[PDB]
Design a binder for this molecule. Sequence first.
Ligand code: MG
Ligand code: MG
Ligand code: MG
Ligand code: MG
Ligand code: MG
Ligand code: MG
Ligand code: MG
Ligand code: MG
Ligand code: MG
Ligand code: MG
Ligand code: MG
Ligand code: MG
Ligand code: MG
Ligand code: MG
Ligand code: MG
Ligand code: MG
Ligand code: MG
Ligand code: MG
Ligand code: MG
Ligand code: MG
Ligand code: MG
Ligand code: MG
Lengths: 167, 260, 134, 185
Amino acid sequence: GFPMKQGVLLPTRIKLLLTKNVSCYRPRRDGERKRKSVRGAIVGPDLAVLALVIVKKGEQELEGLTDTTVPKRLGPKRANNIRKFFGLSKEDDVRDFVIRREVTKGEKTYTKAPKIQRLVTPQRLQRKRHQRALKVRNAQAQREAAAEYAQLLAKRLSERKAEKAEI
Amino acid sequence: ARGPKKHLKRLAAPHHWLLDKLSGCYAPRPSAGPHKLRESLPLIVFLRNRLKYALNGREVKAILMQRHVKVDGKVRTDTTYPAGFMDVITLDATNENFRLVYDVKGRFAVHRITDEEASYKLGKVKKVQLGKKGVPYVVTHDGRTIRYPDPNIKVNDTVKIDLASGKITDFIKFDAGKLVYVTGGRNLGRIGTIVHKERHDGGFDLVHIKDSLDNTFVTRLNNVFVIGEQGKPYISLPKGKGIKLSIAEERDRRRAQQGL
Amino acid sequence: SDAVTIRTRKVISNPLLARKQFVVDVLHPNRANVSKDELREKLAEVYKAEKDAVSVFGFRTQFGGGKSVGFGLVYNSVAEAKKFEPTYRLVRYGLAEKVEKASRQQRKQKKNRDKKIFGTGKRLAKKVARRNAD
Amino acid sequence: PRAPRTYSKTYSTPKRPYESSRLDAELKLAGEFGLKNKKEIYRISFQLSKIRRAARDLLTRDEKDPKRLFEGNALIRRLVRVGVLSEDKKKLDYVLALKVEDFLERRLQTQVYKLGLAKSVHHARVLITQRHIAVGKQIVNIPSFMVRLDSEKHIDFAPTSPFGGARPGRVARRNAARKAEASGE
RNA sequence: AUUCAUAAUAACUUUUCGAAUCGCAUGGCCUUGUGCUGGCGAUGGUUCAUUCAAAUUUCUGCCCUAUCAACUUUCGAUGGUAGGAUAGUGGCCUACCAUGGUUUCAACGGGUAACGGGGAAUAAGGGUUCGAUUCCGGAGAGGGAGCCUGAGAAACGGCUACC
RNA sequence: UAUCUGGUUGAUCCUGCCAGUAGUCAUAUGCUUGUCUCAAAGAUUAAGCCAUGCAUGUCUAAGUAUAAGCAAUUUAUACAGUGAAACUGCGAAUGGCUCAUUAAAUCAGUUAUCGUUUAUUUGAUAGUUCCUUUACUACAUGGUAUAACUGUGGUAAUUCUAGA
Ligand SMILES: [Mg+2]
Ligand SMILES: [Mg+2]
Ligand SMILES: [Mg+2]
Ligand SMILES: [Mg+2]
Ligand SMILES: [Mg+2]
Ligand SMILES: [Mg+2]
Ligand SMILES: [Mg+2]
Ligand SMILES: [Mg+2]
Ligand SMILES: [Mg+2]
Ligand SMILES: [Mg+2]
Ligand SMILES: [Mg+2]
Ligand SMILES: [Mg+2]
Ligand SMILES: [Mg+2]
Ligand SMILES: [Mg+2]
Ligand SMILES: [Mg+2]
Ligand SMILES: [Mg+2]
Ligand SMILES: [Mg+2]
Ligand SMILES: [Mg+2]
Ligand SMILES: [Mg+2]
Ligand SMILES: [Mg+2]
Ligand SMILES: [Mg+2]
Ligand SMILES: [Mg+2]
């Protein structure tokens, strides 16, 4: 049952320290690595099943491979993904084109659809303008606090220079 | 080892919390916050053990999650929030205001203040320094960073903080004759006026303090907190005013006002 | 009749938990351990809210008999009683139902069994069925 | 992990196990006071040892010592409160002179006997153990209770005792039932 | 007490950060455009403070043993200069250099049926014995070593290898 | 709670130990055991070895919901309730156990960091984003690539995983 690993130019099984983001390993902790035995990439009699992908169709239609088509499980969820899936434009209304799936419970046929992500909304723009206005008003408040401190230092300097120069 | 500790065993908590020896293996471990662990009073200890408004921690959490309590004008839903010296605790229900001041036995007292007193606190200036962009700032005893302080403000002085805006209203210097409050050591909770301050350059400045009845004591400067001028504090003192009666006279007034 | 003469001391109003809390000391000479039900009803009339919103607990009786001391809670309405009272006390008063849950060991063992499955596991069941069938 | 509960031993045993003088004096105390053990005498002698030690180092301290004044007055107050030390002779020199018979005089068993009410120390003890005496309104079934000189006028028969009222007693009830059975209605 | 805080100049960089995020309410205004402004929070983020700490660190203090009197210095022992490494000081390591360092005031070694302390037992006073063990500190997870993730572990209800 | 007694002699007085005597949160064991309260407890010998089960997970109004999940929802045909799974985030460095190592080492009290790191908490803090500007790039908002899921599998077996 040991799966083949791409890049192991060998026909036998070898132990390897596997890490995050590699095949034949699902890490269970953070930064956790295991040594596992992996079949090499070289196909040979030692195997039990080959996974193959059809790159070019033949002259005959296979009974369960190519004659059939599997419906796509999920449609697009992001706004621009919907835009490029149905090819509308850079600017358009993507709410109309959202794939709605129909679910029946005997009598009530109700339709559910994904929530569009990165959708431009007044809530998003209000948050944008709020962050901008916060930055500008904090900078102005900083400038006026510095100015108030500056005139305080100038007054204190005038006090001390006059007191020390005359006394 | 290997990292920060999250538990506080009972018998290792600060003694001034007055937690019972039995009925529990642990004590509330104060969260990180404005006051040091040993010098703080967690909100659960205040609400449950001192004010008796809650019978257990679950009720303390129930009270806090409805946002009744507030420390220095902010809700603080945290159960183990480390409230400390001169913190203002407001309960909008019961319309009650508290300032955390030690009584003369070195324990936080249930001391009530009015709305006008609860509008502000006092902070001891822990440090004065120039920040980035050359902007001066002071750091108080409760960790508050206050930008653009008055240049006359030095370390060991006391500032009045608006507590609505984090702003200094006025300040008191550290000089002989000024009323101070002892916030540490074995004289914790005593109130008197500075007689003089001996330097000891290189370590541990000392302060000589005498109270109303001319009892003098010497305390390290780190424990000394200025609270006003000669008389007339800027805060409402608790009962006792830090006099430190002896046990004999303490007993005398016990038998005096217990027999009417 | 037998002078139950319930009285409540150390009364504290707790608007934070929307209730009144107090000690309940009960004089019951020629009697033993009156009840929690009749203490609750009597506290219901004396504080004039409801029997539902009155909670009593504690009630150790003095050595030798004739007196018991406990603690009492009177809430400002039933709904806040159901909000702040513990589940076990509400089940004591019939105001709640003791939730049907499995044994502590059974829950822990089920949790440790479900740790061995990744995903929903119905793919694993399908493959196990098909492998055994064929 | 929890705070240990504190406990202490309340007696010491004597030095020489077999002194005819101590054995006779202990048995005379036990007989005169209706005690069960020699441990009952040992517990009192142990209490004298702690009291005498505390008074001893206080007297080592000079007069007007704040600690000698404070602790010596509290020790005098407690012993006067319990009746072991007389209302006069309120001094540390006098608490040093206290005897075992002074403490045994203040036991509830002795006080129940000496306030009438028992006609014997052994009768007093069985009445006490059998819940017939209330020191105030509180039934006390411990014969070593240390009546504290304000409770003496409050010692009486328990209100829920057949010698206090409201019930004629279990054995008396069974016997009266038998008599009703033999006689009639 | 400083080559401190901070500021300035010329540059530099596999250029760091400087909100493409979320809940509730959705008020105000005039070129009424589904236009311009707008609240109470949540979560993020730089840096400095603080809190929790961590690491290192100053002085003095530890049982029996001389049938243990000299020990360390080749493969750092002791100091200097420079560098490297580290979060940072430091022979921590490296190169070069010097010949130092401890010790009869008991070094070095050996033993311990030694984790240390708060404490415990007994005790006129002085003492004697104990403290694996409810709190504090330390160490370890069969024995070694090594490392990943992480603010933080040389982690073991983490991994790697050997025994 | 500053106490001694028996034993060398024919008798004596000494030295001197043996023996007795009393405690022990001091262990074990024997006999015995009615009540209430309190409550130590595989340390010592073996830090010897372990069957089995449990002891670390966690979701708020507030990161990601098309479960082909349940209720069906408050214009709600983008979503809106609850919400498995799985990404994401945080935690798993605390606790708990033991005393094997360890003799200026640990550790105690007392110092220092003007010799450093510090998630979180709390406070404060960000108008400057223009390659070489006299070559600015959607901002009413950039991109792909994956989990859970679909489906096809391998292995006696694992908290194994592969192909699409
Ligand atoms: Mg630990
Ligand atoms: Mg969130
Ligand atoms: Mg060097
Ligand atoms: Mg160097
Ligand atoms: Mg050992
Ligand atoms: Mg020890
Ligand atoms: Mg120990
Ligand atoms: Mg051992
Ligand atoms: Mg470890
Ligand atoms: Mg083992
Ligand atoms: Mg390890
Ligand atoms: Mg384990
Ligand atoms: Mg562990
Ligand atoms: Mg001898
Ligand atoms: Mg019984
Ligand atoms: Mg063992
Ligand atoms: Mg053990
Ligand atoms: Mg466990
Ligand atoms: Mg973590
Ligand atoms: Mg346990
Ligand atoms: Mg154990
Ligand atoms: Mg963190």
